[PDB]
Amino acid sequence: KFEHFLASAAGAFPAFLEVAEKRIIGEGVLRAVKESMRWHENVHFGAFLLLVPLISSWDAGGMVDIAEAARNRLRRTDFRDSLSVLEAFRLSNLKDRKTEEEIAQKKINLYEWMKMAPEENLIARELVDGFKISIEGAKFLLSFGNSGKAVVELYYHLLSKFPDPLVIAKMGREYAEKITEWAEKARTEEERKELDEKLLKDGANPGTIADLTASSIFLALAEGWR
Template identity: 25%
Template sequence: MSRESPRSPAENAELALLLELAGTPKPGNVDRHRDLEELRFEQFLAGSVGSASGLRMAAAGAPLGRAFERSVAGMSRQSGGNTQFGCLLLLTPLVAAAAQDDLSPSGVERRCRATTVDDAVAFYRAFEHVDVAVGDPPEGADELDARRGAAAEPALRERNMTLWDVMELSADPPAGEPDTNGLEWVEGFPRTFTAADAVLADDGPVTDRTARCFLDMLAAEPDTLVATNHGADTAREVQQRAGKTLTAVRESGSLDPAEELAEAFVVEGINPGTTADRTAATLFVALERGLRV
């Protein structure tokens, strides 16, 4: 599908990060109305701007792993730590595809499948820039624990694991919950493209559309970060609560029920960050396809 945006793909990716942040309310996440205990609105603003050099590398055709690592390094240059690691993992291949006028499920999948062992090594190095909440590696694969950073390089090279292989393992682990960001990578970003169509079909301010998009995706499946931090049962409970809130939002035509859920999640320490990642990816696709701001 041809591009319909007046901005470059890298500019749209940065704008998508900023719009994701501005969307309010996004229950449990930083937005323009609420901070978290250790993460603040302005730190996400700085992270968005800092990621721009890596996003430009992706648009220029740099290897995905290297572009991602650069974007994370830039994002990390603020005082809050990890603000948008998962967002950038999704945006990097999307930007690369859009820059070649190939922003489609098959176009993005081609770029993800073409990744190399060097891309996987760069992905692991990115974990050295910020602390990222990840689950334990599969049994017998401690050497592939992402928290090892660059120390995992020998194991990656010995196993000849590309970045696609790493994402495939996270999407279908031998035990535990699948990572929905990994699923997006290996399935051609189906949730992202479907949600982008819904955002384009919606109306009203983009920040309100963002809030509705976030709630819709949170109600659709358990959030990986919630499952990592609080367990699978809590993630499913959060999904159910989001579903009830989404129904209330649709029936009332107001985002007030989502505001109530947002306040509750902040008090409970529930942070559906993986859903925020996909919201940023969704906004990028929508912007590329003509979403007006």
């Protein structure tokens, strides 16, 4: 499932080059979303919301430098970035209208908005605390070696550690918590397919975990993953 993910994010490469040039967070997420959706239904909105701020700081240095500069750029965003991000979300998928109007009115930038998200929201928490999960994921990969194997090991690691907010919202808190327990016991390749197939038959896709795996890859790449 790495393939699908790699192609679809790669449809957004022109948007990413634009972000590296203009450093425009909101617009960036929105362009990325519109772009990699030109011709497809997986999207991965969260991957873009995670990656665009890191890409906007592509030249800050290594992986700790990027994350810090991305947090700093996030704090200097304005309410229009929030509005773009919100529009990107709706396209990914008068309540939106009322939210948009309060974002506007109170001038709630993307950082401040993210500080008001619930604790289960992993991407929000990355946007606010300097990308701590992505960095930990990057360090995991780096201790491994440049391989697809490492990326898989990363994925199951994140799967056993963080209940997926998308799963929480679809299947409920207890089913999300249960994934972490099944993940930590899915060690062989066979055990892992079982799980994948259970998640599928159930309609439970841990999108955020894959999102975080991607942002971790990005940091590990910038750090030097040899």
